């Protein structure tokens with residue numbers, strides 16, 4: 001714990017709070033190390049906003065000098081987070097809008113109303129599971145019984161993933177995200193995931209349905225998307241759709257239970273559940289780091305330069321704790337704070353999250369339904385002793401022991 005001018009991101013997530021504070025105090029641009037690979041980290045709000053609209057920063061991995069020289073390869077444990085197939089994720093420019101449009105149109109709040117009953121149905125279902133599990137005052141894992149399955153169910157409904165394949169998806173993703181997965185196994189899981197979605201796209205081509213995957217395939221709007229692009233989008237939509245939303249639900253519940261006066265505020269209708277959700281995103285949101293962007297040429301920030309070829313990471317957790325924007329109490333959870341909804345936790349610029357409306361809806365429906373159903377819900381384990389899974393880029397809580405109460 002001597003001074004270092006490069007900040008190593010610990011992959012066991014041993015001290016997230018401290019690391020997040022360190023990242024802020026070294027910011028708003030600072031050198032980080034990711035499992036032995038160097039990059040810059042944007043930890044400031046204003047500077048992130050600027051760079052996320054800066055055209056000289058591209059997603060394409062071939063723009064990465066460390067990928068050109070071959071000093072970073074597929075053996076890097078984080079490689080699956082950026083070296084993926086052509087999709088809205090990995091593209092920039094006029095091409096990019098073509099890859100987003102059907103998704104953004106499908107995920108407008110008004111189109112989402114059609115999905116609302118389905119979400120309600122799954123929330124009711126899994127609450128029933130919660131009732132049965134937590135009977136006779138037993139300790140229950142809120143994640144595995146409620147928060148983990150709900151978002152997969154919902155995104156699978158939207159994309160048209162069959163009910164019976166979802167378990168296997170969840171197993172893959174656990175392996176994919178965990179630092180502890182052997183790299184040879186992770187890459188194999190990555191190939192198996194690719195294989196599954198390739199066949200899902202072929203199936204939806206042969207027999208299209210009332211789902212977004214079928215819309216990605218057959219476009220009214222009216223050049224049709226290629227096979228790589230449909231598959232690519234599909235992958236991005238399910239992975240993101242599931243992994244982030246799980247976190248958002250668990251962190252909201254933790255935040256509110258650990259600040260019961262504030263839970264009271266939303267229950268008695270003085271602050272919207274929605275606002276509670278926004279402050280959760282600012283304070284304790286699903287994304288820790290977002291890999292990764294690359295400079296097509298030198299980028300001059302006045303008293304700093306991002307060199308051509310260099311990798312740039314968006315540290316969205318640190319950005320949410322920005323004191324310049326949120327004030328001295330940034331590190332506090334406060335759903336009444338004036339800047340609650342002024343975060344960029346869904347991102348900014350062209351690559352801004354297209355599912356943001358769905359995420360907000362899922363949480364807005366899930367949270368009041370949870371606490372209405374179980375008003376004396378409380379932790380069977382001190383909330384501050386709930387550990388993160390060793391997942392470096394994602395705010396992935398391990399387990400959430402509760403009693404239904406009463």
Ligand code: HEM
Pocket residue numbers: 088089090100155236237238240241242244245248285286287290314316345346347348350351352353354355356358359
């Ligand atoms: C709490 C929930 C969520 C959080 C915190 C979140 C956050 C983000 C962020 C920060 C990005 C990109 C930021 C950047 O490029 O720098 C993103 C991209 C994306 N997200 Fe969301 N997201 C959430 C839920 C979702 C949902 C529900 C979906 C789909 C239903 C989704 C689908 C996508 C896709 C496909 C991309 C890549 C978009 C692109 O690069 O153009 N995410 N997510």
Ligand SMILES: C[C@]12CC[C@H]3[C@@H](CCC4=CC(=O)CC[C@@]43C)[C@@H]1CC[C@@H]2O
Pocket residue numbers: 080081082084089235236237239240243244286287290394
């Ligand atoms: C980075 C991310 C989790 C990993 C996702 C990413 C969307 C694109 C994507 C496609 C894949 O095939 C692997 C998972 C990834 C790399 C998600 C967007 C927000 C979320 O934090």
Ligand SMILES: [K+]
Pocket residue numbers: 083084085
């Ligand atoms: K690839």
Ligand SMILES: [Mg+2]
Pocket residue numbers: 003004005
């Ligand atoms: Mg120094």
